[PDB]
Amino acid sequence: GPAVGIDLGTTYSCVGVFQHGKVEIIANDQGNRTTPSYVAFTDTERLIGDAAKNQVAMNPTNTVFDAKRLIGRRFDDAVVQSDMKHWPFMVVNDAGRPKVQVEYKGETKSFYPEEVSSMVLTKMKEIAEAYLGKTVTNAVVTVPAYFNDSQRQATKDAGTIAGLNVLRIINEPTAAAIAYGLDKKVGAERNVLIFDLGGGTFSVSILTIEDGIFEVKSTAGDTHLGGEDFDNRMVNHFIAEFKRKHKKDISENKRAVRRLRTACERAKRTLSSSTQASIEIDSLYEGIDFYTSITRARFEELNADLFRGTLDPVEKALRDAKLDKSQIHDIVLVGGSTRIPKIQKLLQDFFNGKELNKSINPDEAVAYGAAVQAAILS
Ligand SMILES: Nc1ncnc2c1ncn2[C@@H]1O[C@H](COP(=O)(O)OP(=O)(O)O)[C@@H](O)[C@H]1O
Ligand SMILES: [Mg+2]
């Protein structure tokens, strides 16, 4: 059976396989090429992926996400203490280790973060198997460059309990470089910049490649900046508009808000290709149907400061690595958010017109590289 490459992401995961010299990003049951890192527990079942995300506004306390933020970490971790203040699900301490507590089939159950991630890992695996028409065993799973040994250990473990034989854990920026073939030996040192703007995490990494050997010279970014922050700005904008037209504040109604957010995220995706998108929501609050729309222009100004601030981590990464803009040879876009036109303009302007590597879907780049790496290791 072919070895596969898996991008176990904070908000979205993706799986690819290298066959016949070509890499293939496998679409799921719903036809999507990336699937949410969501797990939901109900009275009758355990939902994973799209099915899980497609019901979060109905089962908030029992729909788990952001497990990547917990994995390989302790409960006493300041990160965890901060993070949990925003999760609708419970996180309990267990001999120092954090566990997520949910209600499955009427009974109260808790899971270790690596158990949650294995659930997502199993979903990717079954997706691969359904496509390949054969059982998948060996795999290469990716992890951020800043993960310590504990976090990598836990990610590896999430793999074993999923029935996956993890051939190797490689960094996400490194996987992105390999996808574009920037790992080939050209008898010279090459500086590559990875700009990763995903769903809830932002990471900039500068890699130096010589004779096939990578070297993460610098890294910067924000663990709490991603495509979700852009959705929120849209939401706040519409919560205000609704109040104008219908003099009703839907803030308190968690369901109205979550349904509006889903419509915003989708409009956002459209905005990367069109200049305007319509928001059509039936019976948002009470029996009022919310029919409206946004323009790319307005979208851009609602997120202006966020988009712009994206350059700060870029400057920092540069000075740490001790390099000038002119010294970086290649720039590769990773993450779903990099499909945004204004982000591409902004970065290009910063690197004074330099060409951006973006022929491979940024949200598939990591999986793609892992799949190639899985291939060589098998
Ligand atoms: N066309 C698009 N325009 C803007 N954002 C997009 C587009 N397609 C996907 N996204 C966003 O990408 C994010 C997911 O990014 P991804 O890199 O897949 O996640 P992760 O950070 O989990 O690795 C979401 O915020 C989603 O809205
Ligand atoms: Mg990612």
mmCIF file of all heavy atoms in Angstrom, residues 254-286:
data_model
loop_
_atom_site.group_PDB
_atom_site.id
_atom_site.type_symbol
_atom_site.label_atom_id
_atom_site.label_comp_id
_atom_site.label_asym_id
_atom_site.label_seq_id
_atom_site.Cartn_x
_atom_site.Cartn_y
_atom_site.Cartn_z
ATOM 1 N N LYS A 254 -26.536 32.873 20.442
ATOM 2 C CA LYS A 254 -25.383 32.130 19.962
ATOM 3 C C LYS A 254 -25.596 31.476 18.593
ATOM 4 O O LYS A 254 -24.690 31.471 17.760
ATOM 5 C CB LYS A 254 -24.973 31.064 20.987
ATOM 6 C CG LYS A 254 -24.590 31.590 22.376
ATOM 7 C CD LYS A 254 -25.809 31.750 23.290
ATOM 8 C CE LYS A 254 -25.420 32.175 24.709
ATOM 9 N NZ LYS A 254 -24.813 33.542 24.772
ATOM 10 N N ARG A 255 -26.791 30.946 18.350
ATOM 11 C CA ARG A 255 -27.076 30.284 17.077
ATOM 12 C C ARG A 255 -27.091 31.237 15.891
ATOM 13 O O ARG A 255 -26.612 30.893 14.809
ATOM 14 C CB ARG A 255 -28.403 29.521 17.129
ATOM 15 C CG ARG A 255 -28.830 28.955 15.777
ATOM 16 C CD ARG A 255 -30.194 28.306 15.851
ATOM 17 N NE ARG A 255 -30.774 28.074 14.528
ATOM 18 C CZ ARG A 255 -30.454 27.065 13.721
ATOM 19 N NH1 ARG A 255 -29.530 26.176 14.091
ATOM 20 N NH2 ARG A 255 -31.056 26.954 12.539
ATOM 21 N N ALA A 256 -27.685 32.413 16.084
ATOM 22 C CA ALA A 256 -27.759 33.412 15.020
ATOM 23 C C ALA A 256 -26.340 33.802 14.626
ATOM 24 O O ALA A 256 -25.987 33.819 13.445
ATOM 25 C CB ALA A 256 -28.534 34.643 15.494
ATOM 26 N N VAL A 257 -25.515 34.041 15.636
ATOM 27 C CA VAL A 257 -24.141 34.434 15.428
ATOM 28 C C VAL A 257 -23.325 33.367 14.709
ATOM 29 O O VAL A 257 -22.627 33.669 13.739
ATOM 30 C CB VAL A 257 -23.483 34.811 16.755
ATOM 31 C CG1 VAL A 257 -21.993 35.043 16.566
ATOM 32 C CG2 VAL A 257 -24.159 36.054 17.323
ATOM 33 N N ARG A 258 -23.437 32.121 15.154
ATOM 34 C CA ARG A 258 -22.684 31.034 14.534
ATOM 35 C C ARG A 258 -23.126 30.784 13.095
ATOM 36 O O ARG A 258 -22.300 30.471 12.241
ATOM 37 C CB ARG A 258 -22.780 29.759 15.378
ATOM 38 C CG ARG A 258 -21.432 29.246 15.916
ATOM 39 C CD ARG A 258 -21.632 28.229 17.057
ATOM 40 N NE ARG A 258 -20.432 27.440 17.367
ATOM 41 C CZ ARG A 258 -19.759 27.500 18.517
ATOM 42 N NH1 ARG A 258 -20.143 28.338 19.476
ATOM 43 N NH2 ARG A 258 -18.686 26.734 18.703
ATOM 44 N N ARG A 259 -24.416 30.952 12.813
ATOM 45 C CA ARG A 259 -24.916 30.756 11.453
ATOM 46 C C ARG A 259 -24.444 31.887 10.545
ATOM 47 O O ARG A 259 -24.186 31.680 9.356
ATOM 48 C CB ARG A 259 -26.445 30.685 11.423
ATOM 49 C CG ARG A 259 -27.024 29.339 11.823
ATOM 50 C CD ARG A 259 -28.226 28.978 10.953
ATOM 51 N NE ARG A 259 -29.285 29.978 11.023
ATOM 52 C CZ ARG A 259 -30.247 30.126 10.115
ATOM 53 N NH1 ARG A 259 -30.306 29.332 9.057
ATOM 54 N NH2 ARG A 259 -31.159 31.067 10.275
ATOM 55 N N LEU A 260 -24.347 33.085 11.112
ATOM 56 C CA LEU A 260 -23.903 34.259 10.377
ATOM 57 C C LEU A 260 -22.420 34.097 10.051
ATOM 58 O O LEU A 260 -21.987 34.391 8.935
ATOM 59 C CB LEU A 260 -24.136 35.518 11.216
ATOM 60 C CG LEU A 260 -23.899 36.896 10.595
ATOM 61 C CD1 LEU A 260 -24.816 37.102 9.408
ATOM 62 C CD2 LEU A 260 -24.146 37.970 11.642
ATOM 63 N N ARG A 261 -21.661 33.567 11.008
ATOM 64 C CA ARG A 261 -20.233 33.352 10.824
ATOM 65 C C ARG A 261 -19.963 32.389 9.666
ATOM 66 O O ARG A 261 -19.047 32.612 8.866
ATOM 67 C CB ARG A 261 -19.597 32.815 12.103
ATOM 68 C CG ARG A 261 -18.088 32.982 12.136
ATOM 69 C CD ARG A 261 -17.457 32.290 13.335
ATOM 70 N NE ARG A 261 -18.167 32.570 14.580
ATOM 71 C CZ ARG A 261 -18.188 33.752 15.189
ATOM 72 N NH1 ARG A 261 -17.504 34.778 14.684
ATOM 73 N NH2 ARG A 261 -18.874 33.900 16.319
ATOM 74 N N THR A 262 -20.759 31.328 9.576
ATOM 75 C CA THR A 262 -20.621 30.342 8.510
ATOM 76 C C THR A 262 -20.866 30.985 7.145
ATOM 77 O O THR A 262 -20.202 30.647 6.162
ATOM 78 C CB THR A 262 -21.604 29.165 8.715
ATOM 79 O OG1 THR A 262 -21.284 28.495 9.939
ATOM 80 C CG2 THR A 262 -21.518 28.172 7.575
ATOM 81 N N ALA A 263 -21.812 31.916 7.093
ATOM 82 C CA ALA A 263 -22.140 32.618 5.860
ATOM 83 C C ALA A 263 -21.020 33.590 5.502
ATOM 84 O O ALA A 263 -20.734 33.809 4.326
ATOM 85 C CB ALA A 263 -23.447 33.365 6.009
ATOM 86 N N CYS A 264 -20.390 34.171 6.518
ATOM 87 C CA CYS A 264 -19.301 35.112 6.305
ATOM 88 C C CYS A 264 -18.066 34.431 5.750
ATOM 89 O O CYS A 264 -17.480 34.910 4.785
ATOM 90 C CB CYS A 264 -18.958 35.841 7.598
ATOM 91 S SG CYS A 264 -20.168 37.087 8.046
ATOM 92 N N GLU A 265 -17.695 33.304 6.344
ATOM 93 C CA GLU A 265 -16.528 32.537 5.924
ATOM 94 C C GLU A 265 -16.658 32.156 4.446
ATOM 95 O O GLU A 265 -15.698 32.260 3.668
ATOM 96 C CB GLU A 265 -16.413 31.280 6.802
ATOM 97 C CG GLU A 265 -15.065 30.545 6.778
ATOM 98 C CD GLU A 265 -14.908 29.550 5.627
ATOM 99 O OE1 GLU A 265 -15.875 29.313 4.874
ATOM 100 O OE2 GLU A 265 -13.801 28.986 5.481
ATOM 101 N N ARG A 266 -17.859 31.749 4.055
ATOM 102 C CA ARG A 266 -18.116 31.344 2.680
ATOM 103 C C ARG A 266 -18.074 32.524 1.713
ATOM 104 O O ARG A 266 -17.609 32.392 0.579
ATOM 105 C CB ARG A 266 -19.460 30.624 2.572
ATOM 106 C CG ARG A 266 -19.609 29.868 1.267
ATOM 107 C CD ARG A 266 -20.998 29.292 1.066
ATOM 108 N NE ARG A 266 -21.043 28.424 -0.112
ATOM 109 C CZ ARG A 266 -20.795 28.826 -1.361
ATOM 110 N NH1 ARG A 266 -20.520 30.104 -1.618
ATOM 111 N NH2 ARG A 266 -20.853 27.953 -2.361
ATOM 112 N N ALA A 267 -18.583 33.670 2.150
ATOM 113 C CA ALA A 267 -18.580 34.867 1.322
ATOM 114 C C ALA A 267 -17.129 35.275 1.129
ATOM 115 O O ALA A 267 -16.716 35.640 0.027
ATOM 116 C CB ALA A 267 -19.339 35.984 2.000
ATOM 117 N N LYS A 268 -16.360 35.170 2.207
ATOM 118 C CA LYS A 268 -14.945 35.505 2.213
ATOM 119 C C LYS A 268 -14.216 34.754 1.093
ATOM 120 O O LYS A 268 -13.466 35.345 0.326
ATOM 121 C CB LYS A 268 -14.347 35.143 3.577
ATOM 122 C CG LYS A 268 -12.896 35.509 3.744
ATOM 123 C CD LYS A 268 -12.309 34.920 5.010
ATOM 124 C CE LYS A 268 -12.321 33.401 4.964
ATOM 125 N NZ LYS A 268 -11.667 32.831 6.152
ATOM 126 N N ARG A 269 -14.466 33.456 0.987
ATOM 127 C CA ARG A 269 -13.836 32.625 -0.033
ATOM 128 C C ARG A 269 -14.170 33.110 -1.438
ATOM 129 O O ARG A 269 -13.322 33.097 -2.331
ATOM 130 C CB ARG A 269 -14.257 31.164 0.139
ATOM 131 C CG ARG A 269 -13.824 30.537 1.455
ATOM 132 C CD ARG A 269 -14.076 29.043 1.452
ATOM 133 N NE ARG A 269 -13.732 28.428 2.733
ATOM 134 C CZ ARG A 269 -13.038 27.298 2.874
ATOM 135 N NH1 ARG A 269 -12.622 26.630 1.801
ATOM 136 N NH2 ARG A 269 -12.774 26.827 4.087
ATOM 137 N N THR A 270 -15.410 33.545 -1.617
ATOM 138 C CA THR A 270 -15.891 34.056 -2.890
ATOM 139 C C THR A 270 -15.154 35.360 -3.227
ATOM 140 O O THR A 270 -14.754 35.585 -4.367
ATOM 141 C CB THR A 270 -17.406 34.340 -2.799
ATOM 142 O OG1 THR A 270 -18.095 33.129 -2.457
ATOM 143 C CG2 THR A 270 -17.948 34.894 -4.111
ATOM 144 N N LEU A 271 -14.975 36.202 -2.212
ATOM 145 C CA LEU A 271 -14.304 37.486 -2.336
ATOM 146 C C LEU A 271 -12.870 37.386 -2.859
ATOM 147 O O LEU A 271 -12.310 38.372 -3.324
ATOM 148 C CB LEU A 271 -14.336 38.214 -0.984
ATOM 149 C CG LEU A 271 -15.328 39.370 -0.792
ATOM 150 C CD1 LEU A 271 -16.516 39.264 -1.724
ATOM 151 C CD2 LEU A 271 -15.769 39.438 0.652
ATOM 152 N N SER A 272 -12.265 36.211 -2.763
ATOM 153 C CA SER A 272 -10.907 36.030 -3.266
ATOM 154 C C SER A 272 -10.911 35.874 -4.793
ATOM 155 O O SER A 272 -9.866 35.928 -5.437
ATOM 156 C CB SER A 272 -10.247 34.805 -2.619
ATOM 157 O OG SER A 272 -10.036 35.006 -1.234
ATOM 158 N N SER A 273 -12.093 35.698 -5.369
ATOM 159 C CA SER A 273 -12.208 35.526 -6.808
ATOM 160 C C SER A 273 -13.166 36.530 -7.440
ATOM 161 O O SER A 273 -13.016 36.884 -8.608
ATOM 162 C CB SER A 273 -12.655 34.101 -7.133
ATOM 163 O OG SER A 273 -12.585 33.863 -8.527
ATOM 164 N N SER A 274 -14.137 36.998 -6.668
ATOM 165 C CA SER A 274 -15.109 37.964 -7.155
ATOM 166 C C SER A 274 -14.970 39.247 -6.346
ATOM 167 O O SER A 274 -14.264 39.273 -5.340
ATOM 168 C CB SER A 274 -16.516 37.388 -7.021
ATOM 169 O OG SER A 274 -16.547 36.064 -7.531
ATOM 170 N N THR A 275 -15.603 40.319 -6.797
ATOM 171 C CA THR A 275 -15.515 41.586 -6.093
ATOM 172 C C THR A 275 -16.639 41.820 -5.087
ATOM 173 O O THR A 275 -16.635 42.821 -4.378
ATOM 174 C CB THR A 275 -15.452 42.762 -7.083
ATOM 175 O OG1 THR A 275 -16.371 42.530 -8.157
ATOM 176 C CG2 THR A 275 -14.046 42.911 -7.635
ATOM 177 N N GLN A 276 -17.620 40.923 -5.059
ATOM 178 C CA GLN A 276 -18.742 41.025 -4.127
ATOM 179 C C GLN A 276 -19.415 39.664 -3.968
ATOM 180 O O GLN A 276 -19.324 38.810 -4.851
ATOM 181 C CB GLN A 276 -19.766 42.065 -4.591
ATOM 182 C CG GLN A 276 -20.410 41.755 -5.923
ATOM 183 C CD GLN A 276 -21.767 42.411 -6.070
ATOM 184 O OE1 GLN A 276 -22.646 42.256 -5.210
ATOM 185 N NE2 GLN A 276 -21.958 43.140 -7.168
ATOM 186 N N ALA A 277 -20.061 39.462 -2.828
ATOM 187 C CA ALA A 277 -20.744 38.210 -2.537
ATOM 188 C C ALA A 277 -21.990 38.519 -1.721
ATOM 189 O O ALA A 277 -22.010 39.465 -0.932
ATOM 190 C CB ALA A 277 -19.822 37.272 -1.760
ATOM 191 N N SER A 278 -23.039 37.739 -1.930
ATOM 192 C CA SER A 278 -24.279 37.946 -1.201
ATOM 193 C C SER A 278 -24.399 37.012 -0.009
ATOM 194 O O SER A 278 -23.905 35.882 -0.034
ATOM 195 C CB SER A 278 -25.474 37.774 -2.135
ATOM 196 O OG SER A 278 -25.369 36.564 -2.864
ATOM 197 N N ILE A 279 -24.982 37.534 1.063
ATOM 198 C CA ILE A 279 -25.219 36.788 2.291
ATOM 199 C C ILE A 279 -26.734 36.547 2.314
ATOM 200 O O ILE A 279 -27.516 37.492 2.436
ATOM 201 C CB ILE A 279 -24.821 37.624 3.533
ATOM 202 C CG1 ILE A 279 -23.340 38.025 3.468
ATOM 203 C CG2 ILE A 279 -25.137 36.858 4.818
ATOM 204 C CD1 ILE A 279 -22.375 36.881 3.639
ATOM 205 N N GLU A 280 -27.145 35.298 2.126
ATOM 206 C CA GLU A 280 -28.562 34.952 2.121
ATOM 207 C C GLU A 280 -28.848 34.019 3.294
ATOM 208 O O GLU A 280 -28.523 32.828 3.243
ATOM 209 C CB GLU A 280 -28.937 34.274 0.796
ATOM 210 C CG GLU A 280 -30.431 34.002 0.620
ATOM 211 C CD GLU A 280 -30.814 32.519 0.686
ATOM 212 O OE1 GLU A 280 -30.777 31.917 1.780
ATOM 213 O OE2 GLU A 280 -31.219 31.960 -0.359
ATOM 214 N N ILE A 281 -29.392 34.570 4.373
ATOM 215 C CA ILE A 281 -29.707 33.763 5.543
ATOM 216 C C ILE A 281 -31.190 33.807 5.887
ATOM 217 O O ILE A 281 -31.718 34.868 6.225
ATOM 218 C CB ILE A 281 -28.934 34.229 6.782
ATOM 219 C CG1 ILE A 281 -27.434 34.268 6.489
ATOM 220 C CG2 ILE A 281 -29.228 33.287 7.954
ATOM 221 C CD1 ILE A 281 -26.595 34.750 7.647
ATOM 222 N N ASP A 282 -31.858 32.660 5.807
ATOM 223 C CA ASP A 282 -33.279 32.581 6.143
ATOM 224 C C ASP A 282 -33.520 32.517 7.644
ATOM 225 O O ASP A 282 -32.861 31.746 8.358
ATOM 226 C CB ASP A 282 -33.936 31.364 5.494
ATOM 227 C CG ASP A 282 -34.394 31.632 4.085
ATOM 228 O OD1 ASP A 282 -34.654 32.796 3.740
ATOM 229 O OD2 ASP A 282 -34.521 30.667 3.310
ATOM 230 N N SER A 283 -34.429 33.368 8.116
ATOM 231 C CA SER A 283 -34.821 33.424 9.517
ATOM 232 C C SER A 283 -33.615 33.437 10.450
ATOM 233 O O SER A 283 -33.389 32.486 11.207
ATOM 234 C CB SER A 283 -35.717 32.223 9.836
ATOM 235 O OG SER A 283 -36.698 32.541 10.807
ATOM 236 N N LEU A 284 -32.834 34.510 10.391
ATOM 237 C CA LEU A 284 -31.647 34.622 11.230
ATOM 238 C C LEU A 284 -32.028 34.819 12.695
ATOM 239 O O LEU A 284 -31.619 34.042 13.562
ATOM 240 C CB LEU A 284 -30.754 35.770 10.757
ATOM 241 C CG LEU A 284 -29.418 35.872 11.493
ATOM 242 C CD1 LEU A 284 -28.585 34.620 11.253
ATOM 243 C CD2 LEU A 284 -28.684 37.111 11.034
ATOM 244 N N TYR A 285 -32.794 35.870 12.966
ATOM 245 C CA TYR A 285 -33.244 36.165 14.319
ATOM 246 C C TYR A 285 -34.756 36.230 14.232
ATOM 247 O O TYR A 285 -35.302 36.945 13.384
ATOM 248 C CB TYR A 285 -32.691 37.503 14.786
ATOM 249 C CG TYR A 285 -32.769 37.728 16.275
ATOM 250 C CD1 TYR A 285 -32.054 36.924 17.157
ATOM 251 C CD2 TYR A 285 -33.500 38.793 16.798
ATOM 252 C CE1 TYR A 285 -32.050 37.182 18.528
ATOM 253 C CE2 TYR A 285 -33.506 39.064 18.163
ATOM 254 C CZ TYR A 285 -32.779 38.257 19.026
ATOM 255 O OH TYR A 285 -32.772 38.544 20.376
ATOM 256 N N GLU A 286 -35.424 35.489 15.111
ATOM 257 C CA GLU A 286 -36.877 35.417 15.107
ATOM 258 C C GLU A 286 -37.240 34.871 13.724
ATOM 259 O O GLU A 286 -36.756 33.798 13.339
ATOM 260 C CB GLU A 286 -37.493 36.798 15.356
ATOM 261 C CG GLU A 286 -37.134 37.390 16.717
ATOM 262 C CD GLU A 286 -37.773 38.748 16.968
ATOM 263 O OE1 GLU A 286 -38.406 39.314 16.042
ATOM 264 O OE2 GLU A 286 -37.625 39.283 18.090
#
